[PDB]
Amino acid sequence: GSESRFYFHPISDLPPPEPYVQTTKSYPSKLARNESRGGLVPRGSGGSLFSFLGKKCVTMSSAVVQLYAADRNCMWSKKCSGVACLVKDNPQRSYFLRIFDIKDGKLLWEQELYNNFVYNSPRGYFHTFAGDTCQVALNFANEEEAKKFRKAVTDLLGRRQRKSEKRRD
């Protein structure tokens, strides 16, 4: 079901993993407010003075999910199960995706978002997410709640921060 008794199994019905074939994307966070300027012959310079960046990290969306991470080219392994939160960290001007364990609440998994992220959705209670050169995935009983953070992350990223929506309804 959706609540009370909801299943994450089976891994066998979930789509197989894949090595990251996409070129590793850049993290906007590392720059915050800076761009890769060129030299003499190749000279790209954007600049664009963003006036005062940062307030706090705003949580954007939260859903109960189980976290998979793919080993080399083809194995989904359980690293954590719990609840997920999509966070917009405006001080760093980036976004953070954080998975927090339901049992501990420790939060031991983060993924720092890129500036050109497209979301991968097989959709079978299962989403696939891209890392540095590793593949990570989200597994959940509710695609509805899943679409919400999945859409929000990818949509907001494309719109650029015009939302500080804390929770989905």
What is the Cα–Cα distance from 32 to 56, expressed in whole angstroms? 14
- Going 30 to 34 to 36 to 39, the CA torsion angle's sign is negative
Residue 163: Cβ within 10 Å count: 13
The CATH number that applies at residue 162 is 2.30.29.30
The answer to whether the beta carbons of residues 33 and 93 sit under 8 Å apart is yes
65 pairs with which residues across the strands?
82
Residue 82: left if φ>0, alpha if ψ -120 to 50, beta else—which one? left
Report the number of distinct structural domains present in the chain. 1
CA distance 36 to 160: 19
The structure's method of determination equals NMR
What number of residues does the chain have?
169
